[PDB]
Design a protein around this ligand. Structure first.
Ligand code: B12
Ligand code: B12
Ligand code: B12
Ligand code: 5AD
Ligand code: 5AD
Ligand code: 5AD
Lengths: 177, 177, 177
């Protein structure tokens, strides 16, 4: 309970394959792959493609952050998620939500390949957010909360974009119906 | 270890982003999205579409149940999964399994887009079932077992439906082969 | 905390639906389904299809291993992953990596349906590997490490194969860019 089953963080330090930090950046990888599948199978417009590819780049920045313990006075300044990343996601949320009708209930996920795979990506990003909070909980001084805050806003954006993309419009949940 | 990293259940009460109840209803969302991708990329018949869309509606009923703590004498009667939901899944299992050949081993998942994505959905539903049992284990008096029992029968149905949809028939596992 | 929420290992012994061994073989199922979706939606060459179908067969061998407790002098010899399985994955890694250009950074996942879904499968296999290590950690004498070692090499192969399949070539991460 030995080197089998261990691996390294970005500073080379050794962690279990079940380490909370690693689980968080692994789930960012899984989210990034879900976004790649939305791009590859969904056929998005050029503008949505550019947004999603920036997000895929951002997710590696988030994994770099999560994989790099916070230390006092580091050798060289680490790559970290900054508030500016979240401000950018919010700007996109506002712009893409402007034309959507008001929604009063849950929507059944699906629609076009693109809208359905943006819902898949949304749910995987939300899973990554939970893992990112668990990493902060395990290392309150050594892990940034900004990766988790980024993933939180990203799932808002992916919901909005699934609605933009959906040719079925909003198919509403009917509670108990 | 602070309001960062917390959110709300349906009664507004505060929970960690890693709370077992939340993880259970989040995995129902992820399962619902997997079913949406099967619909969107798989091109199912009208009858299978109607069944799967009812299931997607049911999954929000299950998430409403899991997100709403059980209390004595509630203000108003909560939406909960009932045995009738599971009886309906079983009726569908029986009807769709009737024409299938007897199976004597595991089948390699895949086939058409629809059959392959019904296997993906099956595995995500089984993951949600595990999370739903973990929520009951964490709150034996406050969480219903019926969401987990529903998810259990749903994975049976999704297996059956993947076989119906599969144009490759049953491609059998060859142990050690 | 009762038979509700329990199930059986291959020797019939009773385990929780959250048992580490079960979670490991369940995640092998989820990985197997992700590979099936890559096959079904990605349109691979005959050679890649044959490799991936052998891997799908291997994943059931790995689940059989994980589901069967190790005992002294068993009734009959159990099916287990052997080093030969990993040697085969390594041979495939070497052959398929030979023509690829040297890579100096992370690649954004996506590309064709096939390359994008091989990245999805890669990330799910890595999740299964973590679960397989957690099963060993829970049962250091009763669970083999070879399923986890197999899943480790499999994620290397799925990375390599995603690069082979990708018509976009290598789209590189630009840190902070
Ligand atoms: C954390 C981590 C990850 C995380 C998070 C990464 C993130 N940023 O989101 C995740 C789980 C996503 C990951 C995935 C993989 N990783 Co990784 N990862 C690391 C790790 C520990 C730190 C990376 C980091 O973020 N550095 C911080 C950034 C700022 O550093 P940087 O200035 O960009 O410089 C990095 C890159 O140049 C990178 N790099 C250099 N050569 C190559 C070659 C390849 C193929 C890749 C992918 C990267 C890579 O390494 C530098 C130092 O980290 C390193 C080991 C380490 N101790 O540094 C391995 C490492 C980069 N990973 C590696 C590999 C192989 C992979 C995977 C191919 C594993 C797999 N089979 O799935 C994938 C690739 C995913 C992709 N889409 O490209 C190798 C790459 C070397 C090699 N064998 O080619 C490394 C060096 C570990 C090792 N030696 O075995 N990884
Ligand atoms: C549990 C929960 C979930 C769970 C489980 C839900 C289920 N039933 O399966 C999951 C994880 C699936 C979920 C997902 C989301 N949720 Co939610 N969720 C909740 C929560 C806590 C309870 C919902 C519930 O089940 N109520 C029980 C049922 C019976 O109530 P009801 O009579 O149907 O009335 C509900 C609906 O009318 C709903 N509603 C009203 N306006 C709108 C608008 C939108 C867009 C949505 C989705 C719902 C919604 O809110 C009422 C009260 O809950 C509420 C907050 C709360 N305290 O009530 C948030 C809430 C409904 N969720 C919200 C949001 C934003 C989302 C997501 C878009 C988040 C995301 N980015 O992924 C997704 C949408 C998924 C979808 N496909 O539509 C918001 C919606 C308000 C808004 N900002 O538009 C709420 C109100 C929380 C908040 N204020 O920030 N959620
Ligand atoms: C571990 C386990 C799994 C694991 C790992 C399996 C692996 N090898 O990777 C996972 C989670 C993948 C799994 C999935 C399922 N399983 Co399962 N599983 C088991 C279990 C506990 C052991 C299987 C094993 O690996 N045996 C070791 C190998 C070497 O044994 P073997 O010589 O091949 O003989 C096996 C097969 O012939 C198999 N078998 C015989 N008849 C049939 C019929 C079907 C449809 C299947 C799938 C298998 C099957 O059972 C024998 C003994 O295990 C058994 C129960 C048990 N106690 O044996 C159930 C069992 C095989 N599973 C069963 C079922 C139903 C399923 C699922 C359909 C559940 C679902 N709805 O998702 C899927 C099918 C996945 C697929 N793609 O085919 C049933 C099959 C009987 C039936 N009702 O038809 C069994 C017998 C349990 C039960 N009675 O309820 N399972
Ligand atoms: C919309 C509802 O979803 C829940 N919620 C908030 N964050 C997450 C997350 N990362 N993953 C799953 N569910 C979450 C909360 O209960 C919120 O009110
Ligand atoms: C078919 C086999 O799958 C296992 N099993 C039962 N329920 C689940 C679940 N939600 N998820 C994963 N595996 C499960 C049991 O071991 C069963 O016998
Ligand atoms: C490439 C990097 O990915 C991490 N790593 C190693 N194994 C896994 C795994 N199963 N899942 C997620 N990440 C892992 C290590 O940090 C390694 O250095």
């Amino acid at each position: 309970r030995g080197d089998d089953g261990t691996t390294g963080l970005s500073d080379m330090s050794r962690v279990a394959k079940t380490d909370a930090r690693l689980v968080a950046y692994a789930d960012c990888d899984e989210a990034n792959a879900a976004i790649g599948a939305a791009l590859a199978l969904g056929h998005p417009d050029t503008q949505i493609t550019d947004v999603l590819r920036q997000i895929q780049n951002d997710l590696f920045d988030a994994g770099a952050d999560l994989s790099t313990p916070i230390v006092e006075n580091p050798k060289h300044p680490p790559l970290r998620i900054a508030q500016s990343y979240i401000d950018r996601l919010e700007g996109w949320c506002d712009a893409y939500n402007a034309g959507l009708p008001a929604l009063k209930s849950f929507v059944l996920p699906g629609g076009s390949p693109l809208s359905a795979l943006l819902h898949v990506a949304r749910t995987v990003v939300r899973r990554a957010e939970r893992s990112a909070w668990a990493a902060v909980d395990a290392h309150p001084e050594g892990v940034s909360v900004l990766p988790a805050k980024y993933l939180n806003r990203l799932s808002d954006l992916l919901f909005i974009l699934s609605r933009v993309a959906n040719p079925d419009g909003d198919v509403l949940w009917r509670p108990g119906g």
